[PDB]
Write an enzyme that holds these catalytic residues in place. Sequence first.
Site, PDB file in Angstrom:
ATOM      1  N   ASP A  28       0.886  -1.148   0.000  1.00  0.00           N
ATOM      2  CA  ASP A  28       0.000   0.000   0.000  1.00  0.00           C
ATOM      3  C   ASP A  28       0.932   1.207   0.000  1.00  0.00           C
ATOM      4  OD1 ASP A  28      -2.052   1.866   0.306  1.00  0.00           O
ATOM      5  OD2 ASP A  28      -3.127   0.612   1.755  1.00  0.00           O
ATOM      6  N   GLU A  64      -9.952   7.442   4.603  1.00  0.00           N
ATOM      7  CA  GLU A  64      -8.980   6.884   5.521  1.00  0.00           C
ATOM      8  C   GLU A  64      -9.016   7.587   6.878  1.00  0.00           C
ATOM      9  OE1 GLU A  64      -5.108   5.757   3.291  1.00  0.00           O
ATOM     10  OE2 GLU A  64      -6.352   6.713   1.740  1.00  0.00           O
TER      11      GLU A  64
END
Length: 602
Positions: A285, A491
Site C-alpha cells: 500500500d 482513511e
Amino acid sequence: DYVLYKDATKPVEDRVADLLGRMTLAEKIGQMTQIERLVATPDVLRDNFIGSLLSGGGSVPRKGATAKEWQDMVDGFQKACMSTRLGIPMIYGIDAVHGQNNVYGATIFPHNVGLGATRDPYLVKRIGEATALEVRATGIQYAFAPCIAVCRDPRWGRCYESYSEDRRIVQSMTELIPGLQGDVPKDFTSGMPFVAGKNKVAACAKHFVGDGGTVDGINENNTIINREGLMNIHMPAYKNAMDKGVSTVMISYSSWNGVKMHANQDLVTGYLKDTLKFKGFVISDWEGIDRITTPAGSDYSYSVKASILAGLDMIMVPNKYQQFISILTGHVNGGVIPMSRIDDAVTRILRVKFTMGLFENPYADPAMAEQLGKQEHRDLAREAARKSLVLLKNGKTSTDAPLLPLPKKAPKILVAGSHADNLGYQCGGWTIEWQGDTGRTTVGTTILEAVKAAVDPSTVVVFAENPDAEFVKSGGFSYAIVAVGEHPYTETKGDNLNLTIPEPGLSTVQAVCGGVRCATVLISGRPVVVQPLLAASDALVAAWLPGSEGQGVTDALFGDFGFTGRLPRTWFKSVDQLPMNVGDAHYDPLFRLGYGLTTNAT
Ligand SMILES: *[C@@H]1O[C@H](CO)[C@@H](O[C@@H]2O[C@H](CO)[C@@H](O[C@@H]3O[C@H](CO[C@H]4O[C@H](CO)[C@@H](O)[C@H](O)[C@@H]4O[C@@H]4O[C@H](CO)[C@@H](O)[C@H](O)[C@H]4NC(C)=O)[C@@H](O)[C@H](O)[C@@H]3O)[C@H](O)[C@H]2NC(C)=O)[C@H](O[C@@H]2O[C@@H](C)[C@@H](O)[C@@H](O)[C@@H]2O)[C@H]1NC(C)=O
Ligand SMILES: *[C@@H]1O[C@H](CO)[C@@H](O[C@@H]2O[C@H](CO)[C@@H](O[C@@H]3O[C@H](CO)[C@@H](O)[C@H](O)[C@@H]3O)[C@H](O)[C@H]2NC(C)=O)[C@H](O)[C@H]1NC(C)=O
Ligand SMILES: *[C@@H]1O[C@H](CO)[C@@H](O[C@@H]2O[C@H](CO)[C@@H](O)[C@H](O)[C@H]2NC(C)=O)[C@H](O)[C@H]1NC(C)=O
C-alpha cells in the site's frame, strides 16, 4: 534468433520463463517498482526499468482533463518503458473504487456500503463492467478494487468502502471482480490471475487482511482477534477472489495481533500464496513498508528486507524509487535476499502482464475515450443509487398516512439542507480529490436538480439551504425534502468516535419538519447517531453516498420505484455500544442488520 516472449501465440508461462531468463537484476528489481506519476520521467522510467506507475488520490495530469488527455499521459509513460532493452510495458494503476472517480466527468457510482444495501451481486458486477470501460477510456489498465474489508466498527474512516459487517455479504459482492476483469473460463484454477482483454482491467483484492477489524475502528491500527475469527470473518472473501481469478492483492497497513501485515510472511506467503495458491502478484500500500517500522521509514533498509522476504512482489514506493531500488539491490548483491524471492516476484508480475494482454496492447485505444461518462453507465449508477437507499421511517405514527411516495404534482414544495444541492457531498471521499470535496466538482445531478427534473411543470420548487422555522411555516409548502449528513472523508481523516453529523443538519431538519411534513435524506458513509433526526422527521431515508446520479434518490422518493434497500450494517443506539455486530451476545441495535421499510411504485 527467435524471441519466445514476444510471440503472442505462446502460452503465458512459457513467455514469462523466457523473458525472466533474459533479465538482469536491475530489470527484475525495476519490475518490482511502482512509482507515482508525479515523480516519473521518460528517462526515469527508461533508466530504472520501471515496471509500474500509479495515480494516487487526486493525482491528475490537469484539473478537468479529458479522457484523451489521460490516454496521452499514460501512453507517454508507456513509450518510455517500451523503449527499454526488453521493452516490458508498464501497468498503470489507479483507485477506481466507485467508478473512474479521480477522472473529471467520470460516472460516480454509490460507495460500497450503499451497494451492500442492495443485496444485488449482479448489479455490482455490472458496475465493475461499466467501471472497466471508463478506466480503459482513460488508458488505464489496473484498478485498485474491490476493497473487500469487513468493517466491524463504524468509527473506521473507511467503513463506507466495506460492503458490509457481515462477510457473507462481502463475499457475494466479490462479483465486482469478474465485472472488472471478465469471467474466468470454465476450466480455470482458483488462484490464477485473469483479465479478458484490452477492454477489461486487472482488479485488486484489498487490504489483506483484517483491515476492517481494527480496535475502535482506528485506521491502519491493530486487529486483535484469534485465528478463527481472522479466518471466519476477515479471510473468506479472499477465497472467492481467488476462485474468480483476481489479478492482484494489496497488503493492509494494519497489523494482526501485533504483527505488521507488510512483514507477515505466514499470511502473505504461507497462506495467501502457498495455501490459497494465489498466482497473481502481491502489492504493498502507499508507503506500506515504510510504516512497518515506527517512526515510519526510520529503517527503510529493514522495511525493504522485511516486506520482500515476507512475500510481497511489487512495492508502491511511490516516490523515492532511487532509495528503494538502491537498497533492494544491495540486499540482493549481499545474499540477504535470495534470487528465488526476486525471481518469484517478477514471475508473478510478468504472468499478470502477459495474461491481460499488455504486451499485445500496451497503448490506449482512442476509441474508448467515449466510454467515460456514457449515459448508460449513469443510468446504471442511477439504478444502483436508488436500490441502495434504505427507508428507515415512513410516517410518524402507526396511523399516519405514509409520506412516501411523494406526489409529483403539488402547488409549491421545499428542497433544503446542506446536502440537497452539493454534488461533492453526495459523492463522498475518493471523488476528484482524495478526501473528496464540496460543491460541483464534476458532472452530475444533485438532489435539488433531480427534484426539479422529476416534478410536474406546474409544481413550483423552492430551494433554501438552511431556512428557519418561520420561513417554512409561512412558505405555503406541501412537503419538504431535506438532505443532510457527513462531509467527504477518506482513511484516517474519517475516523470518528462521536459519529454525529456536523451542523447545521439536525437543526435544519427540525426547523423544516416543524413547519411542514418532511422527508429527510441522510447522506453518510455509515450509521450515525440518528434518534434526533428520526424524532423530527415524518420519513427518513439512509442514502449512504449515492454518487453523481442524484436522480436515483428521487426515483424512490417520488414512487417511480419502490424502496427495496436493506441495512448492510447494524445501526447502533449509541457509540458506546460499539463494537456491536449481528451475532453478538449483547446485540441491542436501534435497527438490526437486514432492516428496511418498503414501498411500491405508483
Ligand atoms: C466528531 O468527531 C469528528 C472527527 O474527529 C469531528 O469533526 C472534525 O472536527 C475537526 C475540528 O473539530 C475538523 O478539523 C478542522 O477542520 C477544519 C476544516 O474543516 C472543514 O473542511 C473539511 C474538509 O476540508 C471538512 O471535512 C470539515 O467537515 C469542515 O467542513 C466545513 O464544515 C462547516 C461546518 O459544518 C461547513 O459550514 C462548511 O461548509 C464545510 N466546508 C467544507 C470544506 O466542506 C480546518 O480548517 C481545521 O484546521 C481543523 O483541521 C475536522 O475536519 C472534522 N472532521 C470532519 C471530516 O468533519 C466532529 O466535530 C464537529 O464537526 C466539525 C466539522 C466542527 O464543526 C466541530 O466544531 C464539531 O464539533 C466531532 N463532533 C463532536 C461530537 O465533537
Ligand atoms: C494504534 O493506534 C495507537 C493510537 O493512535 C498508536 O499509539 C500511538 O503510538 C505513537 C507511536 O507509534 C505514539 O506517538 C508518540 O510520539 C511522540 C513523538 O512523536 C513520542 O514522544 C511519544 O512517546 C509517542 O511515541 C502515541 O503516543 C501513541 N498513542 C497512544 C497514547 O496510544 C499505536 O502505535 C497504533 N498501533 C498500531 C498497531 O498501529
Ligand atoms: C411491493 O413491494 C414488496 C416489497 O419489496 C414486494 O415484495 C418483494 O418482492 C421482491 C421481488 O420484487 C421479493 O424478492 C421479496 O421477497 C418481496 N418482499 C416481501 C417479503 O414482500 C412486492 O412484490 C411489491 N408488490 C408490487 C405490486 O409491486
